[PDB]
């Protein structure tokens, strides 16, 4: 890699890894549209396996960006509409609080207070229905944002219903395969297990546990090369052959709501570029202003998403206008501000 990229990356990441005590990390910088890879440490401390360009890391919430683009693709196909009532795709959702809650609200955490987590006891299809039927909103739809897996997770599950495919089948065939993400999985195949890094939480090796709507809200596992390719696709959607996929990417980067300096897309979150790095809590309810109608993907934006699981910590950020981006995958869930600080240090130096 160009010495400049080599230098800002190592000078920024090496101190981060030791300050946060990260067992292993992989980073990709997309510069002028080309990827440059870097890796450090261990994928498996006990087995002394290093982190490589083929190592799989749990993406946690960065998985929501795939869910948003898949939903976007379904909209482009004419299979669903964001303006459609949730009950249209789930008829047995007869409880009256749902009148008025659209797929848009579900996709953007604006349904009225759906919880961050789907309860651990919800572990069956009927359990899931019971849960949503009994949920009591705190607010009217389209008034406040409360980040939630029970919200975008449900959007993902309903978005693929017309297709008839399971969420994993639709993700593989409509998003992973067309984009050549051949080492990105919702469920890691035994063939790829030797590359699946262990997560580390308080010194213990851990992998994400199964849970309702896990696939849809935080279940993707991927490599630094496939994530670099995911960023390239999002940086230049118009370069994608598949028409509905190309449009689905643009729809996921459209600005539906605003809270402070941040704009909510489908999965992705955006801020106007240049951004104040300062501008880039277990539960934060924030009033949102509707963007009517939604602003189409803005090239001068810092588009990003943080993600975590018990044992992993991820971050992706890119700036379309500069053909610039970064992916940071670690097998330790460490503070988000540390992620964003290192990302900005690197991208600001290269812009
Ligand atoms: O077990 C855990 O501590 C744990 C933490 C996050 C997580 N991933 S998550 O549910 O998508 C999430 C909740 C709040 S933030 C995030 C995120 O990804 O940034 C998960 O599936 C398990």
Of all protein residues, whose CA lies closest to atom 19 belonging to ligand 1? 307
Q: Please, are residues 175 and 66 in contact by the beta-carbon 8 Å criterion? A: yes
- The first and second tokens of residue 233, run together, are 């696709």
Looking at residue 106, the DSSP 8-state letter turns out to be H
Final resolution, Å: 2.0
Ligand 1: distance of its center to the CA of 294 in Å? 28
Q: Choose among 286, 303, 310: nearest CA to 250.
A: 303
How far does Cα 35 stand from its chain's mean position? 20
The crossing angle, in degrees rounded to 10, of helices 3-20 and 336-350 is 170
Distance CA 309, CA 332 (A): 9
Closest protein CA for atom 11 of ligand 1: 61
Query: Of 308, 331, 333, 340, which is best to mutate to test ligand 1, by the most ligand atoms within 8 angstroms of its C-beta?
Result: 308
Q: Experimentally, how was this structure solved?
A: X-ray
Whose Cα sits closest to atom 6 in ligand 1? 309
Residue 63 C-alpha to ligand 1 middle, in angstroms? 11
Residues with C-beta less than 6 Å from any ligand 1 atom = 60-61, 116, 149, 208, 217-218, 306-310
CB 350 within 8 A of CB 29: yes
- CA dist 305 → 88, 183, 222, 325, 328 (Å): 30, 20, 15, 12, 11
Token pair, residue 167, equals 């969420």
For residue 314, give its domain range.
Answer: 1-351
Q: Distances from the Cα of 12 to the Cαs of 25, 174, 268, in angstroms?
A: 13, 36, 25
CA 287 – ligand 1 centroid, Å:
23
Strands 289-295 and 286-287: unpaired
- The Å distance, Cα 162 to ligand 1 centre, comes to 28
Cα–Cα distance between 285 and 266 in angstroms, integer?
Answer: 18
61 belongs to the catalytic site: yes
CATH of the domain at 26: 3.40.710.10
Q: How far is it, in rounded angstroms, from Cα 146 to Cα 152?
A: 11
Number of domains in the chain: 1
Q: What is the DSSP letter of 133?
A: H
CA 250 to chain centre: 15
**Atom from ligand 1 closest to the CA of residue 282:** 14
Q: Whose CA is nearest to atom 2 of ligand 1?
A: 310
* Catalytic residue selected from 61, 150, 151, 233: 61
């Amino acid at each position: 890699a160009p010495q400049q990229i080599n230098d800002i990356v190592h000078r920024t990441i090496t101190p981060l890894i030791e300050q946060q005590k990260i067992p292993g990390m992989a980073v990709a910088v997309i510069y002028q549209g080309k990827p440059y890879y870097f890796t450090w440490g261990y994928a498996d401390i006990a087995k002394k396996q290093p982190v490589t360009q083929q190592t799989l890391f749990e993406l946690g919430s960065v998985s929501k960006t795939f869910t948003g683009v898949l939903g976007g693709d379904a909209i482009a196909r004419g299979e669903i509409k964001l303006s459609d009532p949730t009950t249209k795709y789930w008829p047995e959702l007869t409880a009256k609080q749902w009148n008025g809650i659209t797929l848009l609200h579900l996709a953007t955490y604006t349904a009225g207070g759906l919880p961050l987590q789907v309860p651990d006891e919800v572990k069956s299809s009927s359990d899931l229905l019971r849960f949503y039927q009994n949920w009591q909103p705190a607010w009217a739809p389209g008034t406040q944002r409360l980040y939630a897996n029970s919200s975008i997770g449900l959007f993902g599950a309903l978005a693929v219903k017309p297709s008839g495919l399971s969420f994993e089948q639709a993700m593989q065939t409509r998003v992973f395969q067309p984009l050549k993400l051949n080492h990105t999985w919702i469920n890691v195949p035994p063939a790829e297990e030797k590359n699946y890094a262990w997560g580390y939480r308080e010194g213990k090796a851990v992998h994400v546990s199964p849970g309702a709507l896990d696939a849809e809200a935080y279940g993707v596992k991927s490599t630094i090369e496939d994530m670099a390719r995911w960023v390239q696709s999002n940086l230049k959607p118009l370069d994608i052959n598949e028409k509905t996929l190309q449009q689905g990417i643009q729809l996921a980067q459209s600005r539906y709501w605003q809270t402070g300096d941040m704009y909510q897309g489908l999965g992705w979150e955006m801020l106007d570029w240049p951004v104040n790095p300062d501008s880039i809590i277990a539960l934060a309810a924030r009033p949102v202003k509707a963007i009517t109608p939604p602003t189409p993907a803005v090239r001068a934006s810092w588009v990003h998403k943080t993600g975590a699981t018990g044992g992993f910590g991820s971050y992706v950020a890119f700036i379309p206008e500069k053909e610039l981006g970064i992916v940071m995958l670690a097998n330790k869930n460490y503070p988000n501000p540390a992620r964003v600080d290192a990302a900005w240090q690197i991208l600001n130096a290269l812009q």
